[PDB]
Amino acid sequence: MLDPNLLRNEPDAVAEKLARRGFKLDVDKLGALEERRKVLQVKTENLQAERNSRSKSIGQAKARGEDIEPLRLEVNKLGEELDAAKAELDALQAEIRDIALTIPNLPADEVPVGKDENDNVEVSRWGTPREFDFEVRDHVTLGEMHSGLDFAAAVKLTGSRFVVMKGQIARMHRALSQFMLDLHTEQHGYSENYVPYLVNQDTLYGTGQLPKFAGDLFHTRPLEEEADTSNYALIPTAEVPLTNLVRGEIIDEDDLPIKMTAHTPCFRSEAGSYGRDTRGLIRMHQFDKVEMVQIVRPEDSMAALEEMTGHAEKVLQLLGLPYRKIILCTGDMGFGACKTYDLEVWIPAQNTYREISSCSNVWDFQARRMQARCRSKKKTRLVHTLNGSGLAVGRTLVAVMENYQQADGRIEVPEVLRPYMNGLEYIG
Amino acid sequence: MLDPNLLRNEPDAVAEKLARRGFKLDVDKLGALEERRKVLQVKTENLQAERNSRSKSIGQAKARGEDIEPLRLEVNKLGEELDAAKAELDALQAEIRDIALTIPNLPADEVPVGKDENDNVEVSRWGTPREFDFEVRDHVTLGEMHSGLDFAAAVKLTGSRFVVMKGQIARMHRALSQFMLDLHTEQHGYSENYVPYLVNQDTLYGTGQLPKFAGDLFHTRPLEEEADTSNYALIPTAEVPLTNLVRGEIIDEDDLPIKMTAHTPCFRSEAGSYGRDTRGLIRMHQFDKVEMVQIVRPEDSMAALEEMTGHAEKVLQLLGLPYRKIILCTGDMGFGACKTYDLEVWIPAQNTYREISSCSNVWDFQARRMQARCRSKKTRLVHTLNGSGLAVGRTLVAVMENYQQADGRIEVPEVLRPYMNGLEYIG
Ligand SMILES: Nc1ncnc2c1ncn2[C@@H]1O[C@H](COS(=O)(=O)NC(=O)[C@@H](N)CO)[C@@H](O)[C@H]1O
Ligand SMILES: Nc1ncnc2c1ncn2[C@@H]1O[C@H](COS(=O)(=O)NC(=O)[C@@H](N)CO)[C@@H](O)[C@H]1O
Known part of the structure; x- marks a missing residue:
């Protein structure tokens, strides 16, 4: 609001x-x-x-x-x-x-005016896309070769836009989430949280999924023994439960910023996506993501946006993944954002960069819905909230598989993941 | 069937x-x-x-x-x-x-006959419950003291029987899952899997949740754009998606045993649990669990049950947690089991042992529903087994209570220190 x-x-x-x-x-x-x-x-x-x-x-x-x-x-x-x-x-x-x-939300003044993704502006780039001396394979082909990505199995278990990962590839997906949580909680100052993956309607209004975006979610039917209190939805991102941890609270300003991270599965209906991103892990009903959320004093949110975006960039840099940083235009931003940077990672088989993180300053928009306030050393005011991917794990796995592939189909394990994969040097 | x-x-x-x-x-x-x-x-x-x-x-x-x-x-x-x-x-x-x-399922012949949980039979016990020189705190009190278990925040986000974990306690919960997956994949021969947490109706019938136990699950409403194919349920255990990975297959016996593990959240309605385990992490709508599943030739399933139960016991031994191994009697077994061992861990604040793993031989009961077969020639149904290695939330309860210190700090078990950036104590 x-x-x-x-x-x-x-x-x-x-x-x-x-x-x-x-x-x-x-x-x-x-x-x-x-x-x-x-x-x-x-x-x-x-x-x-x-x-x-x-x-x-x-x-x-x-x-x-x-x-x-x-x-x-x-x-x-x-x-x-x-x-x-x-x-x-x-x-x-x-x-x-x-x-x-x-x-x-009202866009910040520096957000460029635009109608869609073609009007977004690149603000920086890091790293050089690998020049390959053999025909590159995409992550789906690589995953079939190693019997590590099985989409057919997931259709049998559930349906389209799900995956079963196995063996070394499943271990690498796990290692990516562990490396991300460790970096944010040991080097970036976030406190780790385990959260519910189902949330109530108050929470969905708090972060802005409701009233307009019910169709973007999976909803659970009420439980017979909690008939009037269990109309829940699966979380589409840990931003929803984490940001709502401050709902209804008055926090002393000297106890801000509150910096939280969580690794959760994320569930999305992906409505309006018929025939969009049908290949591989790019657009799934279920994907893992390591999320960062900050609750800050109003004066500090633009500074916190830069810090948090840098925390996401550090994951990409340590993994040796080339990327570009884009500022989204007014017409391409999420409902609650006032300013967003997207990080787009190089994906060799697609010969383009694809979004791996969105980092936003939400200003006081969610804080107003949640009545999340702060008190100065005695009058109260709304806090600001921010959220950013650090990173989407499935898409990070795509980027690692494709950027680290070898001519014979093996995949070199990035240096930073080796301590999380029992010293494994290559997949295959 | x-x-x-x-x-x-x-x-x-x-x-x-x-x-x-x-x-x-x-x-x-x-x-x-x-x-x-x-x-x-x-x-x-x-x-x-x-x-x-x-x-x-x-x-x-x-x-x-x-x-x-x-x-x-x-x-x-x-x-x-x-x-x-x-x-x-x-x-x-x-x-x-x-x-x-x-x-x-038909109970195996060696399963003791009995009416209910009072007729279960203790098989073995390991370790000695700790003797405390101060008043024992429960995991909820310990979790409040360290601002690490927040049940009121979960009621605000969602509702009863959920939790928010924070900081060192959340890191300990994660370390437990990582230690369990690394043990099973690196020492016990299981292949790691990432699985869907939503499954379809055929999958639920395959493992036995359907037709009788729909009320035990959370169900999602169909999606508008997948109107006839998205009647899903949240998984109550990774046993459901893992065991169904062999649905409709004919496997060469030289490719058996198939040993799979996964770490997933588990969702349960907990219907019929009015006022049972109201406080704490023992009975939740959402809990993490590291699951073991074996697909074996029919002749090897009883030996596989001993092996798999031993894999779960090893997690408890390595964590220094006293436990007992119980064989469930006929009247206390779950729907699809032909033989089940209950590993129960010592919970100081309750002055008793609480189940931390169930390990079962399902015989050919799920294999029949799934038409999962093997060839040595003629085909026959495989046998399936599943076992917790372990339920992570209940393991956290056991670690917090058994390793508590007089001042409320919690000693980090030695095997978890490499997964907690060398942290020696919570607090
Ligand atoms: N359906 C999907 N499947 C796979 N990855 C996805 C999907 N939807 C989004 N992502 C990934 O998750 C990232 C963050 O998603 S977002 O919707 O842009 N932003 C958020 O959810 C914010 N909470 C910041 O994380 C995206 O940049 C993309 O990398
Ligand atoms: N609602 C719950 N909350 C927390 N832990 C639970 C809950 N239900 C079961 N558990 C734990 O999960 C373990 C395995 O659950 S089980 O139903 O007994 N058995 C299975 O699910 C089998 N697939 C073996 O894991 C139990 O031993 C118990 O430790």
Whole structure:
């Protein structure tokens, strides 16, 4: 959610910034509801003052031995008028909240204006894509050769967009997640967390999956013994449970930043992807990801974005994987982001770079939904939140398999993963 | 599923064995359906002979120049009767299979007869429970002290019977999983697998979760774009996807045994657990577990059960955790097992042992459902086995409580220190 004061005091300036994202805010519809809400708030306050005064008059008339029936009739009338005005105000506030919950975040001023991915801007590059002296194989072919990636088995067990990994390739996928968690928790200052992989509706509203993106998730049916409290969804990223750990809290500013990481499976319906990324591990219903989340004071979020993006870049550099860093344009950003960097890793068989991390500054947008606040050394204000992949493990495995392949199909194990793979030098 | 030959031709002998595990086979109902099936099979044969004979008569009457119209109508009526016979036979065969899928496995002869968990038999015990010179703290209190187990945060994110682990305790939980996978893959001969955590209905029938235990699982709603193919359930154990990897296969016996391991989250509704293990990590909707699965030739499954149970015992021994090995009696075994060992670990704050692994020989029960066979020639069903090596959450409970110090710090078990960047103590 955006600051309601920006929506009430600068609705036209807010609408203009939102148009850059391709979002059309109906200023006049919201303004008419806000005007009706102000009228109803004044009415409820007037009715409450009038009812309270008439109640004091009853006490006095009763003590004076006067007839209290005319006053009792008035107090009853006023109580019902107050109940009607409160019901109308609650319905109006709900209508306003429903609109407010559909609005994407305001982009930061330095975000370039653009309509889609072609308008994103490269800000830096690292490393040189390997020049091969043989015909490269993609990760699916490499995984078949080593009996390490089995998509057919996953279709039998479950369905499309799942995988079964086996043996040395499964060990390498595990080693990547362990190297990532260790780097972030031993060198980058994040605290490790084990989280639920199912979450409730309050959590989904907190991070912005709800109300607009229910279709992007897998939902579980309620349990018979928890009939009214188990409408859950599988997490699409650890950003959702981690960010919500501060929901409803007031944190002392001196206890910020809070830096968290977790390795979890991530579940996505991938709706709207018919025929998109049908090869291999690129777009799965289930993928592992090592996530970074930061909860910071509002003054420090742009600085924290650079730090967190650097933490993701360090994973790629230590793995020897060439990449490019892109700033997303206004039209290509996620709902809650105000500024995002994507890291795109070189994928030899595709002869292009593919997204391996998104790092975003969410400003106070999720903090507002979650009422996550901070207190200065005594008035409170919303914190800022940030999230970033460090990294998507499946896509990192694709990049390692393809960039480290040898002419005979073996895959050299990157130096940093060897201590996690019992010293193994090559797959195959 | 049981061998259909045994159910059809020695139902009372099968009933005698099933009654020892507390299951009453309805021999009368099954026998009545089987007789209707055999009668319909004969009726179909009578009808087909009549249809072929009347069709042969048409050809003769056509060559002679006689009126073939009455014989043509007779052939059509016989075709309709054959159609009805076949539909009734298919419906009956489905009804018989539906019943067959509700029957538990036959217990092995050496399984002690008993009614419930009080009739289980202790086989062996290892180690000696620690004697404490201070008041024992439970894992929940220890987890609060170190800001490492946060159940209230999990209620806020999700609901009851979930947890959020943080910091050193979360790292210890991870180290346990890594130590277990490395032991099984590097010393015990298991192949590591990454598996789906959602599975389809065929997979659930393959391992026995369906038809009877749908209420034990979390089910996902179908996806709008996979409307007829995405009725999935979250896995309750990696046994489900791993064992189904051999579904529909004919394996050369020289390629057996197949030994697989995986580390996965496990999801369970825990229906019927009102007020049982309300506090802590012992009974959760989500828990991690390092699973072992073996696919073996039928002659080797009892030896494989001893080997696999020993693999799970080695995790406890290496972690210095006292335990007991129990053989479950007939009345306390799970649906698909023919023989199960319960490894139970010492839990200081509860002053008792709690199950940390179940190791089972499933005989040919899942192999039959999955049509997983092997060739030595003729084919036969493989045997399947599964065993926890171990449930990670309960192992964490056991490590936290058994290694606690007077001041609330927790000594890190020696074997986990290389997986915890050399950390000696939690705190
Ligand atoms: N369906 C998918 N299959 C495989 N990898 C995926 C899939 N969807 C996303 N990813 C990977 O996960 C990364 C992060 O996903 S994201 O949606 O862009 N961003 C987030 O989820 C944020 N919480 C930051 O991690 C992507 O950059 C991509 O590498
Ligand atoms: N809800 C739960 N929460 C935590 N741990 C559990 C839960 N249910 C079972 N476990 C643990 O998981 C172990 C194995 O579970 S089991 O159902 O007994 N058996 C299996 O699942 C078999 N596939 C062997 O692993 C149990 O011994 C127990 O230690």
